[PDB]
Amino acid sequence: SGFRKMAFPSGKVEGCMVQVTCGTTTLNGLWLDDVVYCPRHVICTSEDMLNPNYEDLLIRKSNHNFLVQAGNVQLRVIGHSMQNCVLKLKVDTANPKTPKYKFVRIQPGQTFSVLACYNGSPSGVYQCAMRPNFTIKGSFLNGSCGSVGFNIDYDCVSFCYMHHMELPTGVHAGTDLAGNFYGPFVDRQTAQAAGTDTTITVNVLAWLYAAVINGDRWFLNRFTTTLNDFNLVAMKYNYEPLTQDHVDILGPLSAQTGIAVLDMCASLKELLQNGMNGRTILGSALLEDEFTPFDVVRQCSGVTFQ
Amino acid sequence: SGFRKMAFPSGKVEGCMVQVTCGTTTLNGLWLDDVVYCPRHVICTSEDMLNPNYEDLLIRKSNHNFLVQAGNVQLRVIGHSMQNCVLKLKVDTANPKTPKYKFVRIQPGQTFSVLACYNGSPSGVYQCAMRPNFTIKGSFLNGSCGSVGFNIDYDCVSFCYMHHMELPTGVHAGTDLAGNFYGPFVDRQTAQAAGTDTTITVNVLAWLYAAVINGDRWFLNRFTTTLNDFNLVAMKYNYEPLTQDHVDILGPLSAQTGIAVLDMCASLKELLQNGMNGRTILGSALLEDEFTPFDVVRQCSGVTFQ
Numbered sequence: 089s090g091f092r093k094m095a096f097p098s099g100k101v102e103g104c105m106v107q108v109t110c111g112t113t114t115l116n117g118l119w120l121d122d123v124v125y126c127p128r129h130v131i132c133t134s135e136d137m138l139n140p141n142y143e144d145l146l147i148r149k150s151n152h153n154f155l156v157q158a159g160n161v162q163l164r165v166i167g168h169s170m171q172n173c174v175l176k177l178k179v180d181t182a183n184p185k186t187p188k189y190k191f192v193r194i195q196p197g198q199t200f201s202v203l204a205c206y207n208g209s210p211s212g213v214y215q216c217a218m219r220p221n222f223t224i225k226g227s228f229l230n231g232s233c234g235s236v237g238f239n240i241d242y243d244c245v246s247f248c249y250m251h252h253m254e255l256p257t258g259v260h261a262g263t264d265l266a267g268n269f270y271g272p273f274v275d276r277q278t279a280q281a282a283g284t285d286t287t288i289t290v291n292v293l294a295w296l297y298a299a300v301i302n303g304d305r306w307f308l309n310r311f312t313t314t315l316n317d318f319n320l321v322a323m324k325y326n327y328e329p330l331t332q333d334h335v336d337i338l339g340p341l342s343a344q345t346g347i348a349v350l351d352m353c354a355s356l357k358e359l360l361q362n363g364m365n366g367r368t369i370l371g372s373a374l375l376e377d378e379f380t381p382f383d384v385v386r387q388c389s390g391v392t393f394q
Numbered sequence: 395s396g397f398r399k400m401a402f403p404s405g406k407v408e409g410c411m412v413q414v415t416c417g418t419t420t421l422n423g424l425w426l427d428d429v430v431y432c433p434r435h436v437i438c439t440s441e442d443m444l445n446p447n448y449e450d451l452l453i454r455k456s457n458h459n460f461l462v463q464a465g466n467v468q469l470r471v472i473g474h475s476m477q478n479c480v481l482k483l484k485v486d487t488a489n490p491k492t493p494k495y496k497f498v499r500i501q502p503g504q505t506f507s508v509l510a511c512y513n514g515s516p517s518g519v520y521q522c523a524m525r526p527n528f529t530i531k532g533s534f535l536n537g538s539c540g541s542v543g544f545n546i547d548y549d550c551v552s553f554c555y556m557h558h559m560e561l562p563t564g565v566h567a568g569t570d571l572a573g574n575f576y577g578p579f580v581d582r583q584t585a586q587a588a589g590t591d592t593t594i595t596v597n598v599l600a601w602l603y604a605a606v607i608n609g610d611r612w613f614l615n616r617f618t619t620t621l622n623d624f625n626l627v628a629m630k631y632n633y634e635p636l637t638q639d640h641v642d643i644l645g646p647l648s649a650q651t652g653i654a655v656l657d658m659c660a661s662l663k664e665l666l667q668n669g670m671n672g673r674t675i676l677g678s679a680l681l682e683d684e685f686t687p688f689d690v691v692r693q694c695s696g697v698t699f700q
């Protein structure tokens with residue numbers, strides 16, 4: 089027992105991290121087979137950052153302009169192209185540590201592990217969620233661009249996120265691995281506001297189940313509600329509406345705890361309108377929303393990955 | 395910017411994990427060079443669990459009684475011995491994925507990453523701390539014993555923790571890699587109470603600095619205090635005394651933020667006597683105590699590991 093913000097083990101991803109240097113810019117890249125993926129704003133210069141034309145800037149460049157370190161092994165660029173906001177550097181050596189992988193686009197509310205990297209070297213791993221406003225609340229410093237977010241399915245790494253930029257509120261923005269931003273952001277140093285965030289209701293419910301599974305249960309009750317009446321309350325407190333689809337994903341946890349989903353909704357409703365009143369749940373004093381139902385089941389039942 | 399409970403990248407450790415099966419008991423082992431380390435209670439049986447005499451139980455086992463899975467490669471035990479509460483299984487193949495490593499014993503307050511494993515397969519990685527009562531608040535299921543905790547030092551894995559057992563309050567107890575338990579615990583299915591836990595003061599302060607470094611300043615004040623008067627208040631709030639040594643480790647953070655250590659102590663005192671009044675720090679509504687000063691410096695300046 090216990091419950092922790094758990095990341096996927098990061099070994100298959102560390103094997104894919106390289107350094108990409110172009111002009112004065114150094115960021116990380118993801119080396120899979122003979123392709124190195126990285127943010128196209130690597131091609132920018134300090135005065136290019138404002139409103140660049142990347143098509144102009146990219147055609148402006150040669151294969152030799154891209155320095156790619158795989159440690160002390162320098163990879164030679166034999167071609168390059170741009171797919172949306174990612175640059176694809178074709179190199180003459182296929183990464184012998186390439187795992188089975190996919191490129192997936194995740195939906196808001198879903199979680200993933202991030203291997204924060206600098207200079208091609210992994211610095212740490214942590215769990216995040218795709219916020220409803222398509223930002224992520226991560227920990228990224230200058231140099232961390234090219235860092236990736238991923239889930240693992242048994243033996244397959246599902247890449248879902250690459251880091252690009254930090255918004256003024258301290259949150260972060262990036263792309264899937266096909267280069268399309270999550271949310272309405274663009275890779276330009278121009279004022280862009282994240283949009284109002286909201287709490288991922290289905291994830292709070294999942295975390296309340298993890299609590300019960302772990303013996304926290306001061307918060308339950310005899311009351312029930314209907315989806316409709318609960319969602320009137322979710323609007324008031326800035327929460328994602330709960331769908332019947334969401335109720336359906338919460339089935340397994342509901343059946344394991346023997347607490348109906350709409351009963352745990354009543355519980356969340358009382359927590360929302362009365363607060364926690366000095367007590368904690370799973371060591372937190374806030375309603376935690378960065379655990380999916382999958383996350384809870386996996387951790388509270390010991391799924392492993394090969 | 396941003397601040398997350400960040401684990402070390404776990405690749406070097408994943409390459410050392412094996413499955414150890416003896417009798418009806420399966421758990422994880424750590425395979426370094428030609429030695430496989432695992433909890434000695436692997437040699438227990440369901441009725442041996444009570445007050446066993448492991449010296450008796452061990453001399454009475456044979457090398458062939460130990461199944462060691464390195465994935466689908468079965469390792470042959472060629473010798474075994476017991477160092478305190480770990481079993482050291484000598485095998486005829488040295489792990490080709492052995493990293494530079496050290497066995498360290500950590501002090502209370504220090505942190506480490508845990509690679510939670512089942513059947514020799516990594517399930518997830520998370521950060522923990524050695525609580526002042528020598529438990530850890532981990533996430534551990536049946537089959538997880540033999541999972542290790544570790545820090546990384548540029549290229550060197552400092553192993554510090556091997557999981558053995560869960561205490562009734564849901565927390566976890568274990569040994570260093572030399573087999574000596576942390577705290578007054580023994581590997582016996584008998585009533586043992588963890589003892590009263592206390593908050594790690596030096597770590598709370600360091601996290602308050604992380605907050606400032608990240609722009610959470612809503613808790614600062616003009617007041618100062620002396621170590622004496624502050625410790626008088628740590629006393630009252632079940633906080634760990636602050637030493638002049640502790641004040642000295644916090645120097646670099648103090649210098650980088652321009653907030654004297656005893657000014658930050660005045661801030662913590664006010665947070666303790668008055669609560670946070672519905673506000674959060676670094677996205678927590680509690681005072682967080684599982685970031686060392688070194689964790690904050692690592693994360694707020696991007697230390698990498700090769």
Ligand SMILES: *[C@H](O)[C@H](C[C@@H]1CCNC1=O)NC(=O)[C@H](Cc1ccco1)NC(=O)[C@@H](NC(=O)OCc1ccccc1)C(C)C
Pocket residue numbers: 115129132137228229230231232233234252253254255256260274275276277278279280395
């Ligand atoms: C890449 O390593 C780096 C990662 C950032 C740096 C600090 N924390 C991070 O996560 N990303 C950038 O420096 C990025 C370069 C770039 C060029 C074109 C698009 O991105 N720029 C940023 O992240 C900017 N953010 C930004 O432009 O946000 C909008 C904005 C608001 C106000 C005024 C101007 C722009 C930050 C470095 C500010």
Ligand SMILES: *[C@H](O)[C@H](C[C@@H]1CCNC1=O)NC(=O)[C@H](Cc1ccco1)NC(=O)[C@@H](NC(=O)OCc1ccccc1)C(C)C
Pocket residue numbers: 089421435438443534535536537538539540558559560561562566580581582583584585586
């Ligand atoms: C090893 O995989 C397993 C991991 C545990 C199980 C669930 N979560 C974990 O972290 N460890 C054990 O099952 C361990 C075996 C053992 C043999 C000799 C010493 O330990 N036993 C436990 O963890 C016990 N805990 C325990 O004995 O605590 C004291 C106690 C309190 C009340 C009553 C009896 C004993 C649990 C399985 C109860």
